[PDB]
Amino acid sequence: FVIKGNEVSQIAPGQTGNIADYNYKLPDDFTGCVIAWNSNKLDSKHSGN
Amino acid sequence: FSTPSALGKLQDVVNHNAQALNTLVKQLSSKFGAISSVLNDILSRLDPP
Numbered sequence: 001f002v003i004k005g006n007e008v009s010q011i012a013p014g015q016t017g018n019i020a021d022y023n024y025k026l027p028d029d030f031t032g033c034v035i036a037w038n039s040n041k042l043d044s045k046h047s048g049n
Numbered sequence: 050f051s052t053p054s055a056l057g058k059l060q061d062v063v064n065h066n067a068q069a070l071n072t073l074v075k076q077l078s079s080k081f082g083a084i085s086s087v088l089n090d091i092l093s094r095l096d097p098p
Binding site: 014 | 096097098
């Protein structure tokens, strides 16, 4: 999935916010890896994507 | 009848068991390093992890 930088911290166990609560939620006992990187050069447009 | 200390051997047993139970209950109000002694305050103030 694609999210905002201020929402990257929400892809973690126990977090709250519009993404953690309504789009994608991890279990409290989640085991695994959360990998994130900047995609501004690929997803952004001057008109807005 | 006259000597109030005559039965101390039994009164000490009663008092020691009463003190042990009162101490055990009083320990429930301690924090042991936690922010609060009440589980509901911890659950409502902090996120799961």
